[PDB]
Each structure stands twice: as structure tokens, then as C-alpha cells.
């Protein structure tokens, strides 16, 4: 349909730093020739570098990488299993098999070894929504075997927050890509 | 229909420090799953300490609170005159019975939660516009523990640091984008 | 959900100081009451005050103007030629004829000579995604024109860029990350 997303609470479905230590919540709403997002991520594990935050790890990413279906290959820090077309509040029962309309346009956002400043949104964010917390969100798109689209999100903070017991969670985060079709 | 809105150019129909002493413009239009909106608000009119600004007050709030059909509800900083779906450039004549398809998804954005940091949206604005004058503009979702309790609420907070009592400015702010999940 | 773009990946199309030195892309996605828009530019020419930035020039400003039916006029920086309703991966043959439900409303974003901060949106943004690159982008909607100018716009879009930052003695390319906004519809 018009919405591929993780549903709206999900379980852990994230690697940051090992595997399902975050809840990351993505909604791709499809209108027409761009997509609609919105994003959040929050570490759940405790004990992680990033629960609570040590200072030993000043980032925090999660790659998408999708074949030429659209489709989330394996080498993805985001599962599967609840990444699909919506039905209520959850995913459709059966897995996707081309999501084509929800990839970034391969002509605006092209498959590079440059570095293309339009290929991404960079933004000012805060850490936990705290003001004296500023963080940096680059979204990009398209940046073996090898992917045909991808959608990374890289949070980078240059703070020291050891021994003030920060989870790394971010506020909900709007943007808009053109779509491949 | 698929927008609710105060009309592009709303009367005085919000209260900041005291009734109706600012214009506040908000349009949410339904995107299925999202709401994409677009919120200004502007002091007006009324003597305080936000028009002009004398240093007094660095925040400026509104909250609406919204009952289970998604009416808003009296306690809001907004008066509902002219909260309605969209008719041309104006309200339908008719105030609406149901609006959830508009109301922040509570699995998204869970009740009470002002401090879970996926229930806010937080950003960098300018006062005024002007590029030397930041502000945060911090967009909570469902985040309010409150007679009569609301079942959905979105506030809308901007916060300041900077001292402009000598420069005579009444609080007012840029046009701003953001979206969120709808409850239906 | 109608579409009105510059196409995904145009040709140089837009005059920053100079005819087609930048490459202006613009994607306008009707939403209803709403447009949603993402915008991105870069200077494309080399050897101008942009391309690379010698510090002449500290600001980059694109100006559409729209006649009473949203046709973009002859005085804007964007060429029209591949500005149009969206066909696969390009733009359809025909030109078009009307986009009012593309243009800003003139209810919440009046044209003034008074400076009203609800015409524009105002952001931080990064010069090439560089974090120590600190720009500001103001999209400004129904901004006055120049007075000398005949005939008059009836909707406008002013894309702003500006920096304050000395890059002269780097080899930087005026070029920006992709910018998400949106705004209220005239019809
Ligand atoms: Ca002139």
C-alpha cells in the first residue's frame, strides 16, 4: 500500500553496537513522487556503550540496504520481520516482494564514489531533546552483494555524557526524498 | 475532509500569557499514515511580556488538548471558532464531530510520555527570522498528565536564551514543517 | 498526488550570478491543502564566484515568480523549459497551462512591504553537509519584487542561502543537502 514501516512501537529490531540493542522506528507514507518519513531511535540493551553512554562511542547508524525489489537485504542494522506495508496498527502478514515506489530516486540521490551533498539531509538534532545536547543527523540516500538502494542514518555527537546515565534516543524526526517511481 | 486547520489567517485566537493575545496558524493535512503540518504563531495586539519582548518571559506555549474523538477541548490555548475542516479559505460552517485520522498515534507517541523523546519533535528556529536570534521550537505529542483528562494533546513550546529588551520585537515566528503518525 | 519538478537529476537550469552556472533541483508534491517540497542546488560552472567560492559572494538566492494562473515568468532564475507536471523520470511535453493548487496561499503568506516572519521558513543548514560549513536557508514565500519589474508576480518562492564562513583558500563547490518544507496551498 501507501506505508512501509517498522509499525508505529516496535519490539527491539535494531543493531547499533550488537544485535536488537535498539528500538528503531521508521514510517515511509508514499505521496506519489515523494516520500514522506519520519524517524526515532532508541537504545533498550543496558549496559552498551550507548546505555548509558560512556563517551567510548560518539555515534550511532543504522544502514538500510535494499536490492533491486526494494526489498531489506541481511547485511541491514534494522530485522525484517516487521519492516512492511501497513495493516492497522501492525505489517501486512506476508513479506513484500518489491517496494520499488519507496526507494530514493537513483537519478536525484545517484550510486557514487563522490561524496554528493544532495544525496543526504543534514540537520541539527539533541540528544534526548535536550538543547545543550546538539547531535548531527545525516540522512543519505544511496551512499557483497552488493545493494541497488540504501537509506543510512548516522547520528554523531562531540559531547562527553559518562556518568550522567544518557540513554541514546532521539526525538522524532521529519523529511522527504523524491521516490524511484 | 483531509485538512483541519485555523485558516490561513486567523483572527486572535490563542492565548500565550493572556486571552487571545496572539494569532496562532496551524494546518495538519492527512497523508494516510502522517499528518504533515505547517504551525506560526505571532504575538498581538495585547501589552505583555512578549510584545514587546522585555526579557521577562523567554518561552512561549500552546497547548491543545484534544478528547477522544479528537475535538478540541476548552482547556487549549486555542479558542475551536475556526479549528475545523477546510471550506475554500475558510471552515466548513458545521463544527466536526470526529477528526482521530488527525490525532498523534498513541502507539508512536504513548500517553503522558513528555519525556520519552520520541513523543517530541526538537529544532533549531529564528525569532523573528532573524539569524542571530535562536530559538527551540520543542512539538510534544500526547505528552500531557492532566479536568476533563484529554485523550490526545500537541504542544507547541519555543524557548530562548538571548536578551532583546532594547530592540523593541514582539514574539513572532518563521512558517515551520514537521509530520507525525496518525492514530487512524 | 500531483507532482510539478525541476526532473530528478536536471541539466543545468538556474542562474545563481550567471545563465545555467547551477543545477537548482525542485520537486513540489500537492498534499491537498499542503505542498510538500525538497529542494537541493549546486554551482555547476567552474571558475565562478561559486564554483569554487572565492568570497565574493557569501549568499545564493533562486527567485521563481508565478503569473495569476502559478506559470513561472520570465524574470525568475529557474528556466521553465523542464519545469512541469511529473512524466516517469522527466517532465510532461506539453507545457502547462495552471498550477494555482501549487502556489503559496496569499491568506497566510501575503505580499507586504512590511517584513512578516510567517512568509518564510528559516533553518541551519551545511554548506556540502559540512557541519563546520554553518549556513542559513530562508524559503520565502510572496516576496515583493524588484519595483522596476513588469509584469508583476502574483505568487513567488525565494530560496536564500547564506554563510559567513572564508572558504577562498579551500576549492569549494557551492552545493547543498537535500531540504525538506512545506506550505499552504492557494487552492
Ligand atoms: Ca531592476
Redesign the interface.
Not at 537519478?107 to 545517484?110: M, S, T
Not at 551533498?117 to 539533541?126: A, D, E, G, R, W
Given at each position: 500500500k501507501?506505508?512501509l514501516?517498522t509499525?508505529?512501537?516496535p519490539s527491539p529490531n535494531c543493531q547499533l553496537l550488537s544485535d536488537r540493542d535498539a528500538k528503531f522506528?521508521l514510517?515511509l507514507?508514499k505521496?506519489?513522487?515523494?516520500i514522506?518519513?519520519?524517524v526515532?531511535v532508541?537504545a533498550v540493551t543496558v549496559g552498551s556503550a550507548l546505555n548509558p553512554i560512556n563517551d567510548t562511542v560518539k555515534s550511532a547508524i543504522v544502514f538500510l540496504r535494499f536490492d533491486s525489489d526494494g526489498v531489506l537485504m541481511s547485511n541491514s542494522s534494522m530485522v525484517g520481520d516487521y519492516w512492511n506495508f501497513?495493516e492497522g496498527?501492525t505489517t501486512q502478514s506476508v513479506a513484500y516482494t518489491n517496494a520499488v515506489g519507496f526507494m530514493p530516486?537513483l537519478?536525484?540521490?545517484?550510486k557514487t564514489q563522490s561524496?554528493t551533498?544532495?544525496?543526504?539531509?543534514?540537520?541539527?538534532?539533541?540528544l534526548?531533546?535536550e538543547?545543550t545536547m546538539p547531535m548531527?543527523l545525516?540522512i543519505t540516500?544511496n551512499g557483497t552483494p552488493v545493494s541497488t538502494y540504501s537509506m543510512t542514518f548516522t547520528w554523531q555527537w562531540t559531547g562527553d555524557y559518562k556518568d550522567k546515565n544518557i540513554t541514546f534516543?532521539?526525538?522524532?524526526?521529519?523529511?522527504?526524498?523524491?521516490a524511484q517511481e
Open positions: 501507501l506505508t514501516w509499525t508505529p512501537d522506528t514510517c507514507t505521496c506519489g513522487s515523494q514522506l518519513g519520519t526515532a532508541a501497513r496498527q530516486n537519478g536525484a540521490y545517484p561524496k551533498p544532495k544525496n543526504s539531509i543534514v540537520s541539527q538534532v539533541y534526548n531533546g538543547t548531527t545525516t540516500f534516543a532521539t526525538n522524532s524526526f521529519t523529511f522527504s526524498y523524491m
